[PDB]
């Protein structure tokens, strides 16, 4: 299988991870902390010690089934791209929105996607589009969170993953 990876920050990673996990074409989704100022941060550091990390989901997808563009469209369905350092009531830089790449060529793909998303928003988008500086997997307790805690906190409308993308069934 030909896979590609993209890093998405769209608030509490529990909901974002569960969201991408149910999408056909997504191989894996790992919750972690990205683009912060410290190394090997724990959930506590990120949540309270202002390390600068963003709760992020490392999404690995089948490059033969989905394009990066497709993954970004799924992303925009459940994240508010206009709120700075907060997704609803989850406030702080750890909840900032952004897309982090490992390949400089993807920068333009993300920029264009954001540009098109802006077309339908009255408010200016604040989603970050920058290189993945650093990424650290979150504690295993946080992996597959909603799958283990079927009632746990979920700020994402998970069923939106079920709807097909333009030109797909």
GROMACS .gro file of C-alpha atoms in nm:
model
  169
    1UNK     CA    1   0.000   0.000   0.000
    2UNK     CA    2   0.112   0.353  -0.079
    3UNK     CA    3   0.065   0.570   0.227
    4UNK     CA    4   0.113   0.938   0.308
    5UNK     CA    5   0.090   1.120   0.638
    6UNK     CA    6  -0.049   1.460   0.736
    7UNK     CA    7  -0.071   1.628   1.078
    8UNK     CA    8  -0.401   1.792   1.173
    9UNK     CA    9  -0.475   2.012   1.472
   10UNK     CA   10  -0.842   2.086   1.523
   11UNK     CA   11  -0.910   2.094   1.896
   12UNK     CA   12  -0.942   1.807   2.145
   13UNK     CA   13  -0.773   1.519   1.963
   14UNK     CA   14  -1.014   1.256   2.106
   15UNK     CA   15  -1.288   1.368   1.867
   16UNK     CA   16  -1.062   1.432   1.570
   17UNK     CA   17  -0.894   1.093   1.604
   18UNK     CA   18  -1.223   0.902   1.623
   19UNK     CA   19  -1.344   1.107   1.328
   20UNK     CA   20  -1.061   1.015   1.091
   21UNK     CA   21  -1.050   0.655   1.211
   22UNK     CA   22  -1.390   0.578   1.058
   23UNK     CA   23  -1.302   0.720   0.716
   24UNK     CA   24  -1.243   0.469   0.436
   25UNK     CA   25  -0.889   0.525   0.314
   26UNK     CA   26  -0.748   0.625   0.652
   27UNK     CA   27  -0.493   0.368   0.772
   28UNK     CA   28  -0.416   0.512   1.113
   29UNK     CA   29  -0.470   0.815   1.336
   30UNK     CA   30  -0.233   0.882   1.625
   31UNK     CA   31  -0.303   1.154   1.879
   32UNK     CA   32  -0.009   1.363   1.993
   33UNK     CA   33   0.148   1.701   2.063
   34UNK     CA   34   0.296   1.900   1.775
   35UNK     CA   35   0.499   2.217   1.712
   36UNK     CA   36   0.569   2.298   2.076
   37UNK     CA   37   0.870   2.445   2.257
   38UNK     CA   38   0.958   2.141   2.469
   39UNK     CA   39   1.044   1.776   2.416
   40UNK     CA   40   0.868   1.461   2.533
   41UNK     CA   41   0.577   1.661   2.682
   42UNK     CA   42   0.306   1.485   2.881
   43UNK     CA   43  -0.066   1.561   2.868
   44UNK     CA   44  -0.020   1.767   3.186
   45UNK     CA   45   0.260   1.979   3.044
   46UNK     CA   46   0.062   2.059   2.732
   47UNK     CA   47  -0.259   2.126   2.923
   48UNK     CA   48  -0.106   2.336   3.201
   49UNK     CA   49   0.256   2.430   3.146
   50UNK     CA   50   0.218   2.628   2.823
   51UNK     CA   51   0.466   2.420   2.622
   52UNK     CA   52   0.321   2.561   2.299
   53UNK     CA   53   0.225   2.221   2.156
   54UNK     CA   54  -0.102   2.178   1.971
   55UNK     CA   55  -0.313   1.867   2.030
   56UNK     CA   56  -0.258   1.705   1.692
   57UNK     CA   57  -0.363   1.394   1.503
   58UNK     CA   58  -0.108   1.218   1.284
   59UNK     CA   59  -0.326   1.083   1.003
   60UNK     CA   60  -0.184   0.815   0.774
   61UNK     CA   61  -0.388   0.751   0.461
   62UNK     CA   62  -0.394   0.535   0.148
   63UNK     CA   63  -0.249   0.760  -0.121
   64UNK     CA   64  -0.419   0.540  -0.381
   65UNK     CA   65  -0.764   0.604  -0.235
   66UNK     CA   66  -0.746   0.958  -0.098
   67UNK     CA   67  -0.560   1.272  -0.199
   68UNK     CA   68  -0.423   1.518   0.055
   69UNK     CA   69  -0.695   1.745  -0.078
   70UNK     CA   70  -0.959   1.489   0.026
   71UNK     CA   71  -0.820   1.462   0.379
   72UNK     CA   72  -0.829   1.841   0.409
   73UNK     CA   73  -1.194   1.853   0.302
   74UNK     CA   74  -1.282   1.600   0.571
   75UNK     CA   75  -1.089   1.818   0.816
   76UNK     CA   76  -1.283   2.134   0.727
   77UNK     CA   77  -1.616   1.957   0.788
   78UNK     CA   78  -1.560   1.932   1.162
   79UNK     CA   79  -1.319   2.208   1.263
   80UNK     CA   80  -1.405   2.577   1.307
   81UNK     CA   81  -1.131   2.743   1.095
   82UNK     CA   82  -1.208   3.094   1.224
   83UNK     CA   83  -1.154   3.070   1.599
   84UNK     CA   84  -0.808   3.151   1.732
   85UNK     CA   85  -0.661   2.935   2.008
   86UNK     CA   86  -0.998   2.776   2.081
   87UNK     CA   87  -1.249   2.529   1.941
   88UNK     CA   88  -1.579   2.616   2.100
   89UNK     CA   89  -1.514   2.602   2.475
   90UNK     CA   90  -1.175   2.430   2.466
   91UNK     CA   91  -0.954   2.735   2.504
   92UNK     CA   92  -0.577   2.766   2.475
   93UNK     CA   93  -0.295   2.740   2.222
   94UNK     CA   94  -0.307   2.361   2.255
   95UNK     CA   95  -0.644   2.374   2.078
   96UNK     CA   96  -0.533   2.593   1.790
   97UNK     CA   97  -0.618   2.481   1.437
   98UNK     CA   98  -0.352   2.400   1.183
   99UNK     CA   99  -0.215   2.164   0.921
  100UNK     CA  100   0.150   2.062   0.949
  101UNK     CA  101   0.343   1.906   0.661
  102UNK     CA  102   0.653   1.689   0.626
  103UNK     CA  103   0.695   1.775   0.256
  104UNK     CA  104   0.744   2.141   0.151
  105UNK     CA  105   0.545   2.071  -0.170
  106UNK     CA  106   0.233   2.017   0.041
  107UNK     CA  107   0.247   2.377   0.163
  108UNK     CA  108   0.085   2.491  -0.162
  109UNK     CA  109  -0.178   2.216  -0.148
  110UNK     CA  110  -0.278   2.331   0.202
  111UNK     CA  111  -0.265   2.700   0.108
  112UNK     CA  112  -0.494   2.643  -0.190
  113UNK     CA  113  -0.736   2.436   0.020
  114UNK     CA  114  -0.753   2.711   0.282
  115UNK     CA  115  -0.807   2.968   0.007
  116UNK     CA  116  -1.105   2.770  -0.126
  117UNK     CA  117  -1.244   2.718   0.224
  118UNK     CA  118  -1.214   3.096   0.278
  119UNK     CA  119  -1.447   3.145  -0.020
  120UNK     CA  120  -1.735   3.017   0.192
  121UNK     CA  121  -1.648   3.196   0.518
  122UNK     CA  122  -1.726   3.558   0.601
  123UNK     CA  123  -1.475   3.561   0.886
  124UNK     CA  124  -1.103   3.534   0.806
  125UNK     CA  125  -0.957   3.184   0.854
  126UNK     CA  126  -0.680   3.149   1.114
  127UNK     CA  127  -0.575   2.788   1.049
  128UNK     CA  128  -0.196   2.746   1.058
  129UNK     CA  129  -0.016   2.606   0.754
  130UNK     CA  130   0.340   2.529   0.855
  131UNK     CA  131   0.601   2.253   0.862
  132UNK     CA  132   0.573   1.983   1.126
  133UNK     CA  133   0.847   2.109   1.357
  134UNK     CA  134   0.809   1.829   1.610
  135UNK     CA  135   0.554   1.562   1.703
  136UNK     CA  136   0.525   1.343   2.012
  137UNK     CA  137   0.274   1.060   2.051
  138UNK     CA  138   0.032   1.113   2.339
  139UNK     CA  139   0.011   0.859   2.622
  140UNK     CA  140  -0.154   0.529   2.526
  141UNK     CA  141  -0.444   0.621   2.754
  142UNK     CA  142  -0.537   0.888   2.498
  143UNK     CA  143  -0.509   0.660   2.193
  144UNK     CA  144  -0.845   0.525   2.069
  145UNK     CA  145  -1.003   0.727   2.349
  146UNK     CA  146  -1.364   0.739   2.228
  147UNK     CA  147  -1.347   0.376   2.117
  148UNK     CA  148  -1.269   0.286   2.480
  149UNK     CA  149  -1.482   0.560   2.635
  150UNK     CA  150  -1.793   0.540   2.410
  151UNK     CA  151  -1.947   0.825   2.614
  152UNK     CA  152  -1.639   1.043   2.660
  153UNK     CA  153  -1.602   1.405   2.547
  154UNK     CA  154  -1.637   1.452   2.170
  155UNK     CA  155  -1.658   1.802   2.021
  156UNK     CA  156  -1.675   1.659   1.669
  157UNK     CA  157  -1.982   1.563   1.466
  158UNK     CA  158  -1.848   1.215   1.387
  159UNK     CA  159  -2.127   1.115   1.148
  160UNK     CA  160  -2.008   1.379   0.902
  161UNK     CA  161  -1.735   1.135   0.798
  162UNK     CA  162  -2.005   0.917   0.638
  163UNK     CA  163  -2.083   1.169   0.365
  164UNK     CA  164  -1.889   1.115   0.040
  165UNK     CA  165  -1.659   1.372  -0.118
  166UNK     CA  166  -1.722   1.532  -0.459
  167UNK     CA  167  -1.691   1.259  -0.721
  168UNK     CA  168  -1.703   0.966  -0.479
  169UNK     CA  169  -1.969   0.728  -0.347
   0.00000   0.00000   0.00000
